[PDB]
Amino acid sequence: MGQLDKTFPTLDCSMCILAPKMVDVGKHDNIELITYAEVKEVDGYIGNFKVKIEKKPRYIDEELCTGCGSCVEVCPIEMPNYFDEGIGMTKAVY
């Protein structure tokens, strides 16, 4: 949904309506968001699931990074951006 420009059948902006929900998720007291991570093991049963997740190394501190983007501006290496689906470029840090 975040990659779409508009949405049918209303041709309304997709991001304009999705971003508030993303912010709500990011700042909800009852939600713990773990991005750049994958579910590795699931054991147990209903009410009693033990889940082991691996958070991949960003090499960036999530608590300290403000997403200002200076590192992106200064990086010299270009690489494809997954968000652009193979037609857009970004830096090694993005």
Binding site: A19, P20, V23, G26, K27, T66, G67
Partner: protein, 178 residues
């Protein structure tokens, strides 16, 4: 009244037509305004953090945001101010995206003048705003389900299994629907 003004670029949706530098500069110079700042995406978490930090530091008691229509994000900025201690009703919204920037693309200068006038009107209104405590009302923990088809049956069973007492009104002598 210590008014803090926050002009949103919205990327290039206001910025591209309206000069979010000339508009912030006027707001800083208008009477009673103690800060004027611009941020790329104010509704996002960093923008709300900036507003809260400004309120805490400079002691702003009035918040004016030059951003999209209030019908979209007025509740957002209202809960923002409160988490930082201000009353929700001390905040004002200036509509410079749907009313100014998206409808006067061929007149950037007229667009900027209109944005200046709209921010002036917003600050004029915000000067005279006062706190208002909103009243809470209890929510009855009961549900009514009109229609006894598959959808209504599913809704009633889901509500009843979650613990809520539910009424199901059906016009036919029996439930089932189509």
């Amino acid at each position: 009244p210590k008014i803090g003004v926050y002009v949103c670029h919205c990327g290039v949706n206001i910025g591209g037509v309206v000069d979010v530098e000339a508009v912030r500069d006027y707001a800083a110079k208008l009477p009673n305004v103690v800060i004027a700042k611009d941020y790329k995406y104010y509704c996002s978490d960093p923008g709300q953090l900036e507003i809260q930090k400004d309120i805490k530091e400079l002691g702003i008691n009035r918040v004016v945001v030059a951003a999209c229509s209030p019908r979209l994000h007025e509740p957002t900025f209202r809960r923002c101010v409160e988490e930082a201690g201000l009353n929700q009703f001390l905040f004002e919204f200036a509509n410079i995206r749907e009313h100014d920037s998206w409808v006067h693309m061929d007149n950037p200068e007229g667009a900027t003048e209109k944005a200046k006038d709209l921010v002036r009107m917003a600050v004029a209104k915000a000067r005279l705003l006062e706190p208002l405590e909103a009243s809470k009302v209890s929510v009855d923990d009961k549900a009514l389900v009109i229609g006894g088809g598959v959808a209504g049956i599913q809704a009633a069973l889901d509500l009843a299994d979650m613990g809520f007492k539910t009424y199901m009104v059906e016009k036919r002598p029996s439930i089932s629907g189509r």
